[PDB]
Design a protein around this ligand. Structure first.
Ligand SMILES: [Cl-]
Ligand SMILES: [Cl-]
Lengths: 75, 223
């Protein structure tokens, strides 16, 4: 895909989940994470697994951010 | 106890004992959702009545038992609170805000109560099936890996870690002819836009620890 495809995909993501960003630095970081996740999902779904992946409201989070705030089991 | 004596499948959803999928949002409150789901299911299994219960109460009011609201917690400490405090309020009475706040449990009626809580015997699929025959079961898993973050549908048989960091609920089990794999039916708390309308079909035969560690720290309320 070209950059414009990723750019369109991120705008749709922003619209669909009402994601906005308080700084241009945050938006560029979140765009980069989003692109990386999007590529991951697309590649994964070509590999013939028993399960599929799909973009969702965690699309602009890295694994570390996801783990730190969106889980919560502490033994 | 004999496996023949267990049903081929169990799904508490189609028995009417599972509330709609909920969403913890950006708060480390999964433990509270796993707890309320187990209590909703156990109460309904016993009485035939499904009452949606308060995660926020658990978050706000169970710090004495070891839980830390959006900073994390565990299901057994939450069951202990429910036992300690004489029960839990309804979701409607004490709704979910996804934020830390002071306890207001004087503000509502305790609608569901427990006698105690039990751990599922460890590292046994048969023991988990037997528990699920009785009611939904609270489980802890590692849920931070990318395939987990973006899971959509199908039997999730991904190579999974066992660093337990998320608390969810099993509501049954069955078998998938598409992938030819047996599964557990898991209910998450990340809303209906994640997974299969909020659910995940987890591979059943992934060794003694369970898929993503689900046989390591499973428990349920006794009513
Ligand atoms: Cl923006
Ligand atoms: Cl990963």
């Amino acid at each position: 895909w070209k950059e414009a495809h990723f750019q369109d995909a991120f705008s749709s993501f922003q619209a669909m989940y009402a994601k906005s960003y308080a700084t241009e630095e945050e938006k560029q970081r979140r765009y980069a994470i989003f692109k990386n996740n999007l590529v991951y999902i697309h590649t994964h779904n070509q590999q013939g697994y028993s399960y599929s992946l799909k973009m969702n409201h965690f699309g602009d989070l890295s694994r570390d951010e996801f783990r730190r705030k969106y889980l919560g089991f502490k033994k | 106890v004999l496996p023949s004596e267990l049903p081929a499948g169990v799904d508490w959803r189609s028995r009417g004992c599972v509330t709609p999928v909920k969403d913890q949002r950006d708060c480390g409150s999964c433990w509270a959702f796993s707890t309320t789901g187990a209590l909703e299911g156990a109460h309904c299994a016993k009485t035939g009545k499904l009452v949606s219960l308060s995660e926020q109460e658990l978050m706000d009011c169970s710090r004495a038992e070891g839980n830390q609201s959006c900073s994390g917690g565990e299901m057994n400490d939450a069951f202990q609170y429910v036992l300690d405090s004489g029960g839990i309020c309804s979701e409607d009475a004490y709704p979910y805000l996804a934020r830390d706040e002071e306890c207001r449990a004087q503000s509502c009626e305790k609608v569901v109560k427990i006698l105690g809580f039990k751990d599922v015997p460890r590292r046994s699929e048969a023991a988990m099936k037997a528990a699920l025959a009785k009611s939904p079961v609270s489980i802890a898993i590692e849920a931070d890996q990318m395939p987990f973050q973006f899971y959509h549908e199908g039997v999730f048989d991904a190579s999974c870690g066992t660093d337990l960091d998320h608390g969810v609920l099993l509501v049954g089990y069955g078998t998938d002819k598409e992938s030819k794999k047996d599964f557990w039916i898991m209910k998450n708390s990340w809303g209906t836009g994640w997974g299969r309308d909020g659910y995940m079909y987890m591979a059943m035969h992934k060794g003694e620890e369970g898929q993503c560690g689900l046989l390591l720290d499973a428990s349920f309320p006794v009513m």
